[PDB]
Design a protein around this ligand. Sequence first.
Ligand SMILES: Nc1ncnc2c1ncn2[C@@H]1O[C@H](COP(=O)(O)OP(=O)(O)NP(=O)(O)O)[C@@H](O)[C@H]1O
Ligand SMILES: [Mg+2]
Ligand SMILES: [Mg+2]
Ligand SMILES: [Mg+2]
Ligand SMILES: [Mg+2]
Length: 318
Amino acid sequence: QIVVGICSMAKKSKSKPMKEILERISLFKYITVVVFEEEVILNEPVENWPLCDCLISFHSKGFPLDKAVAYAKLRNPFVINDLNMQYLIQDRREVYSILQAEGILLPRYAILNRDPNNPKECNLIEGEDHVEVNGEVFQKPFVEKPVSAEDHNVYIYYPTSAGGGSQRLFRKIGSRSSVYSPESNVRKTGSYIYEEFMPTDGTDVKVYTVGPDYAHAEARKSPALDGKVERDSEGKEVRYPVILNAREKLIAWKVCLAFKQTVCGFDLLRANGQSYVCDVNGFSFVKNSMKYYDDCAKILGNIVMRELAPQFHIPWSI
Ligand SMILES: Nc1ncnc2c1ncn2[C@@H]1O[C@H](COP(=O)(O)OP(=O)(O)NP(=O)(O)O)[C@@H](O)[C@H]1O
Ligand SMILES: [Mg+2]
Ligand SMILES: [Mg+2]
Ligand SMILES: [Mg+2]
Ligand SMILES: [Mg+2]
């Protein structure tokens, strides 16, 4: 049988969507799924990791990407989500750089790099209602994102005309995804991307690809101006229906290919009659959609069969 190896932290490998999708992939007659134990990933050298013919592997906090890369070099499996690109996905500067090169619309932005080596170096000037970054003016409202994509402490600064202060976003704690601060001055230490605030209807469009020709999208309330998480009478976070237009289906095709991540999530801001990518997250599954589980598993299984059936001498059509 063709072995599909799953290599990620246990929180990811044992998540409900993963388990649901792996169940369905296992339904393919000629595929066996092997899920790598976290103790093995963390503690064993790659020479002892299980064999696989196709590798689905992805970084999250604590994951040794260096080892996954070394495993792939050692065993040369068919890789679903490219491993080296996952270093770049961790850095918002690298993400924005790739997006620009693909001709993908994104917010106007400037990178402020703080090198602690040089103290004479100053590339940001702050005024009451704007910053100047590398000589470029960003009037409030603007967004300030840590260069680390894993750092979810993204701030938004309000104009004096709106009451000033700032909204501090963070990884969702229970009932809140952000909070207002009276602080009107930008952060003094660290490197950041400053970007123009894009006016939307108050929602984010979340896109989930499974290869470049399949994209699932849904909307959620933005944490931008209000941190209170919306919850249904059951208890789940409230989501809204979305159908991607032609332009957006093309954005999805480009993002999937440009980052070499078969399974990829990214965010769109629908503003001023266009759609702007603000964030590229890499490996991401939809939660609580049976149709997504069905489609994702079928697409992945078909990708594996198409690629590997020939060398395994398995009958397979188109
Ligand atoms: N330029 C922008 N204009 C308007 N809203 C923005 C802008 N940039 C980010 N936002 C809002 O702030 C949210 C968080 O920014 P985002 O870049 O997604 O941060 P993140 O920390 O990478 N979040 P996550 O999706 O959990 O990985 C977005 O979902 C938008 O609601
Ligand atoms: Mg099977
Ligand atoms: Mg993708
Ligand atoms: Mg995001
Ligand atoms: Mg992100």
